Design a protein around this ligand. Structure first.
Ligand SMILES: OC[C@@H]1C[C@H](O)[C@@H](O)[C@@H](O[C@H]2[C@H](O)[C@@H](O)[C@@H](O[C@H]3[C@H](O)[C@@H](O)[C@@H](O[C@H]4[C@H](O)[C@@H](O)[C@@H](O[C@H]5[C@H](O)[C@@H](O)[C@@H](O[C@H]6[C@H](O)[C@@H](O)[C@@H](O[C@H]7[C@H](O)[C@@H](O)[C@@H](O[C@H]8[C@H](O)[C@@H](O)[C@@H](O[C@H]9[C@H](O)[C@@H](O)[C@@H](O[C@H]%10[C@H](O)[C@@H](O)[C@@H](OC%11[C@@H](CO)O[C@H](O)[C@H](O)[C@H]%11O)O[C@@H]%10CO)O[C@@H]9CO)O[C@@H]8CO)O[C@@H]7CO)O[C@@H]6CO)O[C@@H]5CO)O[C@@H]4CO)O[C@@H]3CO)O[C@@H]2CO)O1
Ligand SMILES: OC[C@@H]1C[C@H](O)[C@@H](O)[C@@H](O[C@H]2[C@H](O)[C@@H](O)[C@@H](O[C@H]3[C@H](O)[C@@H](O)[C@@H](O[C@H]4[C@H](O)[C@@H](O)[C@@H](O[C@H]5[C@H](O)[C@@H](O)[C@@H](O[C@H]6[C@H](O)[C@@H](O)[C@@H](O[C@H]7[C@H](O)[C@@H](O)[C@@H](O[C@H]8[C@H](O)[C@@H](O)[C@@H](O[C@H]9[C@H](O)[C@@H](O)[C@@H](O[C@H]%10[C@H](O)[C@@H](O)[C@@H](OC%11[C@@H](CO)O[C@H](O)[C@H](O)[C@H]%11O)O[C@@H]%10CO)O[C@@H]9CO)O[C@@H]8CO)O[C@@H]7CO)O[C@@H]6CO)O[C@@H]5CO)O[C@@H]4CO)O[C@@H]3CO)O[C@@H]2CO)O1
Ligand SMILES: [Ca+2]
Ligand SMILES: [Ca+2]
Lengths: 523, 523
């Protein structure tokens, strides 16, 4: 620009305010792919994934949120949980479409099971039915010599893929063969990764390891087709990364120095949260904790790889318990409750600077719920990450409750509720009378019969640049359709869109969402 | 904070997010004091000012906005206009309360006029009635020897006051005696401020000048009592400063080098705005323009003093045509239309840095309406000034219209409408059918009979930290109560609260506003 008082160019008034496309207002639907309908006991990355994306596009949604896509819990008290991953980087092979494998010629139509009961995932039977079919497809791929074989070889040898996949495959092979509760009790040559012991595992467990890798390839190829189709329809996919990983995983076993373990590989201190204004007990989670000091010394190489894999799967993703990056609660591993721990200093912004330097700009959503400290807020703003608002948490205190729409900010994500909340209708049904009248006053004395439209419109009309609705709320469902009740160990993660509902029968629901997206500028 | 991975103090979780009191959510009423009811032809800084502040406090409002308090236009085509000030720094003596002067013993009850017609200010008769009474009070003060005389002497000699008041008094005295259209035609010794000519003006015009100063003192003392009472009730007063001043003023005559004048004191270039997407002609305003280059050389001393006087009157204030600080439209003074001008580079942030250094933090509101350029937005954010949203401008384009609530930001001021807009009911009455249905869809298909509650609630429920309602909208008034129709020359600035309405009869209106302030967190 010229000197003060001098002429601007003739065209000055054409220099209109800049609108960063990273600020675009968007709406999305939360729907885990297990919840897709179909005849094979669980949703998959097949025909219904494309039908869903067409319905999202018809509704004018530009985002799809999923839970972690990792191989879930197999213990009887977390069966199907996306948050009890066996591995941080692998894909859940139960999401592999039997129909897409028939198209590939890796399965025969004849080998597909007869139609299975359609309304809920049965996690105690689904692996016994699908696992042998996915294994069969992986064996046919390994013995083939065409296009798909070449792609498998390119995947296997890719430096980003092999950096997690080799360790995950050998871990699964040793776990399968040794079958102790944890790698802490493996024979010393396997526990401490003797080069010679690992070469002998590949000799004795070759078919297990090649099959494990081919299954991860079949997942990768299906997911990339879904993500390519999403992008073709203007849809971004938002994933979900828990800050911590499980002890019994390749993540810890093949990267022991990244964690605070004693000399025998047992965790010194484990994760949780202390008591606060809302909890008398706090929570003992019991994950191992990162050696953030040793990580800083190698430029956070372990976290950089974890983020690289996440950007391979997702356009953007939430980090659960984001506050752990500023400060984290650490319980001595011998303790049975949360109270006896201490706050430690998290890595803060340098972790994010190292990620930006190695991977470039990533779109992270900070899960920043509950009682957090000013350093958490400062860290989040310093990296310009959006936090979360959840409307189901907004109406039970006073007008300073940060979840109320007049307290929202532009760089934020607003939900009606997450996978951890009841549906809007279920929440409403158990809500005290005093909170209900408070909800109805706030939404400008709207009628109680319209609570769902009320909360959906309250999320969509927010200044928050992303609004997310659970699919259950679009379908008008009650408590029977809740994805998770926190701290219960049965009937979670099993909700599916019922057989009587199909995406081609949801035109009215699409139109109703699209009209409010148009009004509130999210198209 | 300690090293990464080390212990935080035991009290870590007590360090809750910081809430800057400069971010507090607040509501205010726009009401120019001329609009106060009472028996003397115009509102004043007397009993009704205190009654209004009590009603604001009962309604839970924490802000009161006024128009400029300067001595207004006396030409027949801008009679009463606060935006045709005779002076940037003086107070309008017509706002002086005859009743407060009786309390002081400067007027006798017997000298007050009989009750005058109460519903509209008559600008063609009000000066002839009040001027002689305020003059009488000023003469009694000048001949007195008590408390008020001492305060007058302290006011007169105050370095901040004398820096504008002496020039304003001598200007008014010469203007009164010489009586040309402008100071451009004054005799050379008065036009060019010969020291000897100015000493002779004080000899020959002593009573005019002493009276002018005593009147400014009586204004100052009344206004400070209003502002002290406001503060006692938790009310901030927001004023209004036009960026430009008038040519025929002490502001220009006593500060010629601050302006772009030729060697005879005639403006080289004058203010306006060029054509844009919304105007074929643009506007020729015709004020003189600042020599921003020469101002930078003395640390913007003229602007610093203007801001010092404004903070003497107001807690915070709007600057009209804030965009002039980044870039300003300059028309050669010989031209009769706006098209033939040029954009010049405004002073930008250094003006604001010099103000911060000399006066400390000030709360400025940027009037940033219409087509503005990215440099205007950049300047506003660089000084963290709030811009404006106006709901009457929100519903006539598409969903990207910045006045719609989903586009508001926290650091912003939202109005239903300003003194330049019709009332909500008047605007609604002339609004096209297509815009009306658009308004009703946006506010979630609210009933047309409730448009006023709809727009008031839409301003109060905004994320904007300040919401302002015109008093006319609280009283449910139509187009007959509009304060100004831009570019008309009759019947403007004359609306008063009618004689049948009193602040003690407005309890229901106070309660109705207070309840929505409570719901949307502005108490
Ligand atoms: O031991 C134990 C056992 C054993 C072991 O160890 C373990 O592990 C376990 O186990 C196991 C099990 O068993 C099984 O079951 C399985 O599991 C599982 C599960 O179950 C499931 O669920 C899953 O999970 C997962 C999930 O899904 C995912 O998602 C994830 O999660 C996680 C996350 O991520 C993280 O982060 C965490 O979270 C959490 C947290 O931490 C905590 O904290 C909590 O939070 C919460 C809270 O509590 C509540 O309350 C809510 O909140 C809210 C509220 O409500 C509202 O209201 C709002 O707030 C606010 C307000 O409003 C305002 O007002 C403010 O306040 C304040 C005030 O102002 C002032 O004045 C003061 O005050 C007070 C008062 C107040 O009230 O009070 C009283 O009176 C007193 O006196 C005073 O003081 O202050 C205050 C404060 O400061 O503010 C506020 C704030 O803003 O809002 C909020 C929100 O935001 O909500 C929340 C929620 O968030 O909780 C949570 C939880 O949820 O964690 C999690 C976990 O948990 O992940 C997960 C995990 O993974 O999965 C799994 C499966 O696998 O398994 C196992 C084995 O392996 O057991
Ligand atoms: O010559 C002449 C003559 C003479 C001389 O010289 C002069 O002076 C004169 O005079 C005198 C007179 O006569 C008497 O009467 C007296 O006076 C006076 C008056 O009357 C009164 O009134 C008073 O005044 C005062 C007042 O009161 C105060 O207040 C102050 O004022 C001022 C201020 O401060 C400043 O600032 C200024 O203002 C202005 C401006 O400048 C301009 O511009 C304008 O504006 C406006 C506009 O125009 C309208 O239109 C509205 O707007 C809005 C809209 O509507 C909405 O819609 C929104 O917008 C937005 C949208 O929505 C979106 O969409 C966007 O747009 C865009 C788009 O997107 C794209 O696409 C593009 O496009 C286009 C299309 C569009 O439409 O079109 C077409 O088609 C094409 O083709 C294309 O292009 O682009 C676009 C754009 O860029 O965006 C947008 C934006 O955002 O919103 C908006 C808003 O914001 O509104 C506005 C309003 O603002 O106007 C204004 C005015 O009003 O100035 C003023 C003044 O004027 O001060 C004043 C003064 O002082 O007082 C006085 C008394 O004294 O006197 C004398 C003697 O002395 O005559
Ligand atoms: Ca086992
Ligand atoms: Ca004259």
């Amino acid at each position: 620009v010229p000197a003060v008082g001098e002429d601007f160019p003739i065209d000055y008034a054409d220099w209109l305010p800049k609108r960063d496309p990273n600020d675009r207002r968007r709406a999305g639907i939360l729907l885990h792919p297990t919840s897709f309908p179909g005849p094979y006991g669980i949703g998959d990355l097949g025909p219904q994934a494309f039908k869903f994306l067409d319905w999202l596009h018809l509704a004018g949604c530009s985002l799809w949120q999923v839970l972690p896509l990792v191989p879930p819990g197999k213990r009887g008290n977390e069966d199907g949980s996306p948050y009890s991953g066996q591995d941080a980087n692998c894909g859940n092979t139960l999401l592999i479409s039997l129909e897409e494998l028939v198209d590939d010629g890796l399965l025969k139509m004849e080998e597909l099971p007869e139609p299975l009961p359609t309304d809920r995932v049965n996690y105690s039977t689904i692996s016994e039915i699908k696992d042998p079919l996915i294994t069969k497809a992986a064996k046919r791929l390994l013995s083939s010599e065409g296009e798909l074989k070449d792609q498998l070889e390119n995947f296997r040898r890719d430096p980003n893929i092999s950096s997690w996949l080799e360790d995950a495959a050998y871990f699964a092979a040793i776990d399968n063969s040794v079958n102790t509760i944890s790698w802490y009790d493996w024979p010393e040559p396997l526990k401490n990764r003797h080069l010679a012991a690992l070469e002998e595992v590949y000799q004795s467990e070759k078919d297990f390891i090649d099959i494990f890798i081919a299954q991860q390839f079949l997942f990768q190829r299906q997911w990339k087709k879904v993500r390519d189709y999403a992008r073709s329809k203007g849809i971004s996919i938002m994933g979900d990364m828990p800050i911590y990983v499980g002890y019994h995983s390749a993540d810890v076993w093949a990267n022991k120095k990244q964690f605070l373990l004693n000399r025998k590989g047992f965790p010194l201190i484990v994760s949780g949260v202390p008591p606060d204004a809302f909890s008398e007990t706090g929570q003992l989670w019991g994950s191992p904790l990162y050696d953030w000091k040793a990580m800083e010394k190698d430029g956070f190489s372990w976290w950089v790889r974890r983020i690289q894999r996440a950007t391979d799967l997702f356009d953007e993703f939430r980090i659960d318990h984001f506050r752990g990056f500023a400060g984290f609660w650490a319980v001595p591993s011998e303790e049975k409750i949360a109270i006896l721990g201490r706050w430690k200093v998290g890595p803060g912004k340098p972790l994010f600077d190292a990620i930006l330097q190695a991977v470039g700009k990533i779109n992270i959503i900070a899960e920043d719920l509950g009682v957090i400290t000013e350093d958490v807020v400062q860290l989040r703003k310093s990296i310009e990450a959006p936090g979360m608002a959840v409307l189901q948490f907004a109406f039970g205190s006073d007008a300073e409750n940060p979840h109320l729409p007049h307290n929202h900010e532009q760089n934020q994500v607003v939900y009606t509720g997450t996978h951890d909340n009841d549906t809007i209708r279920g929440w409403w049904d158990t809500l005290p009378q005093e909170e209900k009248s408070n909800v109805l006053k706030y939404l400008s004395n709207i009628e109680e019969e319209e609570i769902s439209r009320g909360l959906i419109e309250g999320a969509v009309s927010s200044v928050a640049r992303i609004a997310i609705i659970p699919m259950q709320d679009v379908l008008g469902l009650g408590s029977d359709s809740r994805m998770n009740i926190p701290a219960t160990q049965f009937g979670n993660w099993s909700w599916r869109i019922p057989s009587s509902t199909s995406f081609d029968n949801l035109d009215a629901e699409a139109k109703k969402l699209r009209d409010i997206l148009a009004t509130y500028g999210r198209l």
